Amino acid sequence: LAAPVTHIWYFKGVPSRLGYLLDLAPKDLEKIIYFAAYVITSVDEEMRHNELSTLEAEMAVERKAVEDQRDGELEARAQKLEADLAELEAEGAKADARRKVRDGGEREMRQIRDRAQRELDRLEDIWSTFTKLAPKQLIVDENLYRELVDRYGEYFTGAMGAESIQKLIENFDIDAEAESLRDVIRNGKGQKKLR
Amino acid sequence: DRVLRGSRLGAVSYETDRNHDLAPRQIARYRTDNGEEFEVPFADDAEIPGTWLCRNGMEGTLIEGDLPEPKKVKPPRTHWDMLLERRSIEELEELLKERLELIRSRRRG
Amino acid sequence: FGFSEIMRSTLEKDNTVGTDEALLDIYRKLRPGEPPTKESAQTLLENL
Amino acid sequence: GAMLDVNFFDELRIGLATAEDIRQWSYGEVKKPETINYRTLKPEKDGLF
Amino acid sequence: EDESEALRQARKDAELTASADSVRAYLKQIGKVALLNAEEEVELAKRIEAGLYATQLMTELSERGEKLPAAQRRDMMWICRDGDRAKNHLLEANLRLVVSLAKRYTGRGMAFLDLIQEGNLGLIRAVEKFDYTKGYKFSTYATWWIR
Amino acid sequence: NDLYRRVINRNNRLKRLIDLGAPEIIVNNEKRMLQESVDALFDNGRRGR
Numbered sequence: 001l002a003a004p005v006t007h008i009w010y011f012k013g014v015p016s017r018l019g020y021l022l023d024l025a026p027k028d029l030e031k032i033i034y035f036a037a038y039v040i041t042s043v044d045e046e047m048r049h050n051e052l053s054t055l056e057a058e059m060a061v062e063r064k065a066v067e068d069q070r071d072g073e074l075e076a077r078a079q080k081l082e083a084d085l086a087e088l089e090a091e092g093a094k095a096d097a098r099r100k101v102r103d104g105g106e107r108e109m110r111q112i113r114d115r116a117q118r119e120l121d122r123l124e125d126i127w128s129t130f131t132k133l134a135p136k137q138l139i140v141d142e143n144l145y146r147e148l149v150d151r152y153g154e155y156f157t158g159a160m161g162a163e164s165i166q167k168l169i170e171n172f173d174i175d176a177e178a179e180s181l182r183d184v185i186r187n188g189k190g191q192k193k194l195r
Numbered sequence: 196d197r198v199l200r201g202s203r204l205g206a207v208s209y210e211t212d213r214n215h216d217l218a219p220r221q222i223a224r225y226r227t228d229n230g231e232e233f234e235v236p237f238a239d240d241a242e243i244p245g246t247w248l249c250r251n252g253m254e255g256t257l258i259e260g261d262l263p264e265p266k267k268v269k270p271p272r273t274h275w276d277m278l279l280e281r282r283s284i285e286e287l288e289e290l291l292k293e294r295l296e297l298i299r300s301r302r303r304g
Numbered sequence: 305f306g307f308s309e310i311m312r313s314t315l316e317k318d319n320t321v322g323t324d325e326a327l328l329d330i331y332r333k334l335r336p337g338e339p340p341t342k343e344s345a346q347t348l349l350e351n352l
Numbered sequence: 353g354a355m356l357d358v359n360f361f362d363e364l365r366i367g368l369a370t371a372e373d374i375r376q377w378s379y380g381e382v383k384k385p386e387t388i389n390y391r392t393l394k395p396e397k398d399g400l401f
Numbered sequence: 402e403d404e405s406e407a408l409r410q411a412r413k414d415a416e417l418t419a420s421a422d423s424v425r426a427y428l429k430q431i432g433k434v435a436l437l438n439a440e441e442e443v444e445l446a447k448r449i450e451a452g453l454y455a456t457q458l459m460t461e462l463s464e465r466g467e468k469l470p471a472a473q474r475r476d477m478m479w480i481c482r483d484g485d486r487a488k489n490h491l492l493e494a495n496l497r498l499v500v501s502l503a504k505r506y507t508g509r510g511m512a513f514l515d516l517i518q519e520g521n522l523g524l525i526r527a528v529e530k531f532d533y534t535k536g537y538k539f540s541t542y543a544t545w546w547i548r
Numbered sequence: 549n550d551l552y553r554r555v556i557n558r559n560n561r562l563k564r565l566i567d568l569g570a571p572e573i574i575v576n577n578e579k580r581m582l583q584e585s586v587d588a589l590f591d592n593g594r595r596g597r
Contacts, residue, residue, distance in 0.1 A: 001586075002563045003579050008587040012594050025417075030595075035580045036419070036426070140417055161579060204393045252381030274529050275457050278450060281532055287454040291480075294451040298476045324403045328411050337420035337429065340411050342403075383560075385553040400552055416590055421596065423584060427577050489571045496573070518561060521574050 004162045006033050022168055033091050033162050036137045041167045043156040051155065052131070059127055063120070070116050077109045126151070136168065223247075255301035424513055431496040439538065445487045446533040452484015489527055492521075498540055499524050502547050523547040551589040556581045 010017045011033065014024045024032075031037040061089045084105060088098050104108055130141075133156060145158065159167065185193055220236045220299075225247045227233075234247045244260045249255040278287075305311035320326050324342070331345040353365065386399035395401035420426050436443050437445075453479055462468070499520035525548035531539065562578045587595060 001559055001582070002566060003582065005583050005586045008590045008594055012591075031419070034423075034583065035576050104594065160576070204395075205390070248380075250378065250380050251375070252383060274453060277529050278453055282450070287450065290447060290451050291454050291458075294448065294480060297474060297481055302472075302476075322403065325407060328407055332411055337415055337418040337425065340408060341414050342408070350453065382552075382556070385556040385560075387549060387553075399550060400556075423577075423580060423596075428579075429575075432575055492571055493573060514577070515557070518574070518578060518581070521565070521570075522561075525568065525570065 001084070004166055006162045007163060018165070022136065022172070024136060024167075031138065031140075032160070032164060035161055036140075038142075038145045038158050038160050039131060039164050039168075040135050040137045040139065040156055040158050041164050042135055042171060043133050044154070048133075048155045055130075055152075056127075063123060066116075066119065066123070070113075073112050074109075077105065077112065081105050081109075096155075135171070223256035224258045225249060226258045227251060227253050229253065231255075232258065417484075427514065427517070428500070431493070431500065432530045434496070435491045436490045436497075437491075442491070442539045443533050446531060448487040449484050449491075449528075452480050452482075452487070455480040455484070490526060492524060495528075495539070495543060496521070498543065499547060502544065512528055520547045551585075551592075555582070555585045555589055558585050 006018070011019075011029065016029065018024070019026050019029050022029075028037070032039050043194075081102060084101055088101060091098065126144065129144070130148065130152055139148070139158070149158070219239045221239060222234050222236050223243050225233050225235065227249055229251065231249075231251065233247075233255060235247060237243065243257065245264070246254050246256050320329060327345055327349075328340060330339050331348060335348070353363070354360075382398065382400055384396065384399045386396040387401050388394070389396055420429060459481070460475055468474075500517055503513070503516040503520045506516055523546045524543060527543035530546065531542060558578065558581050562575075562582055564567055565578055584596075
């Protein structure tokens with residue numbers, strides 16, 4: 001085979017042995033091995049640690065430049081509304097028809113700041129999902145994963161499919177995992193102990 | 196539904212199965228480009244071929260180097276040849292510099 | 305359905321107003337994975 | 353364990369086959385989706401047969 | 402409040418679904434990229450030819466000659482990268498043409514997605530063989546190789 | 549022979565696409581098809597139609 005392929009017996013039949021080994025839900029495992037969602041195979045820690053400070057400085061700078069273009073939009077809409085004031089303050093018409101154009105301009109300003117809120121929430125979500133990055137974490141929205149890849153090509157590796165599953169099985173310590181599991185069954189109780 | 200009678204495309208011979216006097220054989224040794232070696236028993240009155248298709252699906256050459264292995268052709272259906280068969284070098288050059296002017300006038304004046 | 309305690313109870317518990325909103329709801333419960341448009345979501349039940 | 357299947361058995365152990373076991377069982381790589389030549393009915397080279 | 406607000410919410414909820422059939426998943430994957438026109442196809446073809454000549458020239462020069470103009474080498478690699486970007490964009494534009502041609506051969510012999518991927522190979526060959534100097538619509542030339 | 553032929557066909561086409569150089573949509577669709585073929589070989593009707 002020119003690309004690795006998982007055995008169907010160890011993934012589909014309940015209980016899913018790949019899911020129990022890697023601690024992945026079956027609906028989040030089928031999405032990996034049938035090419036619907038990416039998966040962070042590995043991540044750096046200390047380079048991430050100092051580049052947290054440097055990259056949050058760069059992120060604040062980029063968001064500040066976004067706010068600079070946003071106040072350019074604010075001032076441009078203010079000058080446009082003052083031009084509408086100059087070209088509607090001496091035209092004899094109805095009391096609301098001379099002001100419905102200004103209300104439409106203010107509605108245009110309201111949707112401009114709504115779009116600014118939308119892109120700032122997008123940038124906030126990108127920074128949040130970099131700051132909460134870990135292995136065995138699915139990333140839906142290929143656009144969002146693409147943005148993480150082209151902005152943060154270092155500090156982590158991600159993949160998609162049975163090659164990623166093979167990489168996760170390689171980066172796996174059965175002895176440490178078994179010590180954690182036996183610690184849980186010695187200490188905890190309930191659903192966590194049954195799991 | 197029927198009494199259908201079918202045969203696979205081969206015939207069974209039945210002679211004696213003896214193992215005391217056989218035709219003489221000598222073992223060649225081929226090594227691939229994987230660093231893995233295979234042994235094949237040929238006949239005595241048989242010319243040893245230089246390259247044998249081993250059990251890995253890859254061509255293994257002989258382990259005793261004797262042959263001037265040839266200099267066979269590149270597969271000539273590439274995009275560069277399919278471009279050259281309908282274009283000219285000066286046309287590609289003027290298009291290259293015209294495309295170069297875009298990055299030069301984008302990065303600088 | 306003026307006589308039916310069950311029907312008026314379910315109209316109290318429907319948690320959905322708006323014909324277009326209910327139509328989008330049944331479109332999402334019926335067709336999974338398709339981007340809903342207004343005319344296709346309207347004519348889906350009629351064509352079905 | 354032996355695989356000639358003469359009747360000297362003690363066990364029958366089943367495991368999980370690795371790729372280096374599969375390409376050690378095999379006798380060659382089948383690499384064409386051909387079975388039998390349509391006119392002469394002889395098994396094709398590097399096919400399934 | 403039904404002016405694309407609840408429609409947008411249901412659109413994102415449908416975008417985050419599963420869609421467990423492979424044909425439906427491939428159609429939803431190829432539906433994202435928008436279509437093109439003649440001038441866009443012309444400029445993509447010109448970028449393809451420029452990038453191909455750039456990488457051919459750089460290989461045949463660096464085989465026997467070493468030079469270091471930094472800006473020139475950087476823009477040469479820029480041309481080589483963005484030519485392949487243009488080629489990938491052209492293929493992803495014409496995937497719907499491939500599917501629309503291959504949908505009429507179903508039911509006899511092969512599957513659906515085998516037909517679609519064979520049309521994909523034919524489309525790659527048509528993009529290789531395309532010429533813009535004769536000045537025609539790209540679909541009329543590519544239909545021959547796809548079929 | 550049909551299941552083995554589908555696996556061998558899709559694997560050869562994938563080798564052609566990878567060594568040719570194709571975009572990610574085509575290559576990922578080919579890999580998903582190869583995975584579904586091997587799954588249908590080992591157990592038919594387990595995941596999907």
